[PDB]
């Protein structure tokens, strides 16, 4: 009726290495001392403090989705018994990500200031409609179509927000707050590659006919999400004046979202076009 | 409007906070523990004792696999607070760590083909397969309350038929690292039973006495059936080495803790003094 999981009889060699990489990257928000960033924080403007809350607020919401219904839908299309175990680690760390944003708020912000942020996220047109498209794919979509959405979310669209803490890290501002985002990106870079790898296995098993049919919907989704994100980026970054530098940051990460799935790069935006202080933050 | 961002500064149930804290603080991996140091005491065992160890862990491996894949998956869909789902993500991950940890024990102690022999038997066992069938059927079809009772009975009560062996050796100062990796599993499952059993009592006290007398009837009916089948699995293993009646004493004892977590009274009269003293030395050390 049921079969036991065996880590001596490996079916896919990547399942072992990814578990050994994701578990050994385990981290908690309670360890990192956020109180050391308050000296830098209080020397920011209202414009900058407002931006930061809306950024981390947006990421909180998108990491909530992945922990609740994202990886829960992804586990249904699992090949090996080990892969379901690796998705269990992944799903836990998504809850860690979601929580870590609230821990960052508990240092920097007050009671009312937090209620403001969550009131904004729960009512935001861009975010609520973005989760509406992504969660439709998790409930209704196929095995290959869901794996495409998760990679497009966390390896591409999530970098709309990540831009800001990385920018501060380059200038040596808010070193500990960015340290949380650092560890999220350390996890999320492996989240994309593993899904992209498994996507690649089932994609090759699909016949020539149905591959191009999926690629058609792949790029349709990619364009509609970038369409929606451009308006969201303008809302955040206009008054500070980075609107165009975040756009050349999104297209750079779209290329990686393609590359993990096993595709040719669509945009010509290189790593040099990206802000060098942000790119120094990455390094 | 469509979805909700989880806010940990807006906690609904205060035990979500503490259960997350405790379990995350109780994070661990099998790769840390040095199992090669127990090869000195492992090889000082007969075929009667060596064969019992693999059948025990392998049998539990089936049930830690059951929990990680479908068990916590079922429990997640009947969530009260957003934070509870997060706790269950942590729970489900640790259930996979428990499932893996057994493979690390087998790798050090046993050989390639010896591991194939153990896994082959556990997947074709008359007791374990039927035992898992009763539990998974509840997860797939049972209602939000019956699934909580089954997971508590599973890991708080009938898991300890297997835990009796490594706890016995730990009391004799034998198989220390093989005991610690099991010791850590019990530390996690002790908290799981309490948390799952607590959320059970919330939804249990919301029903009228009408539906409470029916569930309690379905509860003890499931208790005695799992106990009777466990007495078959106990006699299937422990009769040669001759600890059959001690495991039965240990099973009746931990059955009360599963009851106590779910908010019910202790059924059996078997206390800590009735259980083997060196096994109780293993739990308290
Ligand atoms: Mn994430
Ligand atoms: Mn992910
Ligand atoms: Mn377990
Ligand atoms: Mn459990």
Automatic annotation (TrEMBL), chain A:
Active-site residues (renumbered): 101
Species of the source: Streptococcus sanguinis (strain SK36)
Cofactor(s) this protein cannot do without: Fe cation
Function as written in the Swiss-Prot or TrEMBL entry: Provides the precursors necessary for DNA synthesis. Catalyzes the biosynthesis of deoxyribonucleotides from the corresponding ribonucleotides.
Family according to the record: Belongs to the ribonucleoside diphosphate reductase small chain family.
Residue numbers binding Mn(2+): 63, 94, 154, 188
GO CC, one annotated term: ribonucleoside-diphosphate reductase complex
NCBIfam families per record: PRK09614.1-2 (NF007183), PRK09614.1-4 (NF007185), RNR_1b_NrdF (TIGR04171)
Cofactor-binding details, from the entry: Binds 2 iron ions per subunit.
Protein name stated in the entry: Ribonucleoside-diphosphate reductase subunit beta
GO process annotations (BP): deoxyribonucleotide biosynthetic process
Enzyme Commission code: 1.17.4.1
UniProtKB/TrEMBL annotation, chain B:
Gene Ontology molecular function: metal ion binding; ribonucleoside-diphosphate reductase activity, thioredoxin disulfide as acceptor
GO CC terms in record: ribonucleoside-diphosphate reductase complex
Keyword check for Metal-binding: yes
Domain of life: Bacteria
GO biological process, one term: deoxyribonucleotide biosynthetic process
InterPro entries, A to Z: Ferritin-like_SF (IPR009078), RNR-like (IPR012348), RNR_NrdF-like (IPR026494), RNR_small (IPR033909), RNR_small_fam (IPR000358)
Necessary cofactors: Fe cation
Keyword annotations of the record: Deoxyribonucleotide synthesis, Iron, Metal-binding, Oxidoreductase
NCBIfam families xref list: PRK09614.1-2 (NF007183), PRK09614.1-4 (NF007185), RNR_1b_NrdF (TIGR04171)
Description of how the protein assembles with itself and partners: Tetramer of two alpha and two beta subunits.
The protein's name in its UniProt record: Ribonucleoside-diphosphate reductase subunit beta
Originating organism: Streptococcus sanguinis (strain SK36)
Phylogenetic placement of the source organism: Bacteria, Bacillati, Bacillota, Bacilli, Lactobacillales
Gene name per UniProt: nrdF
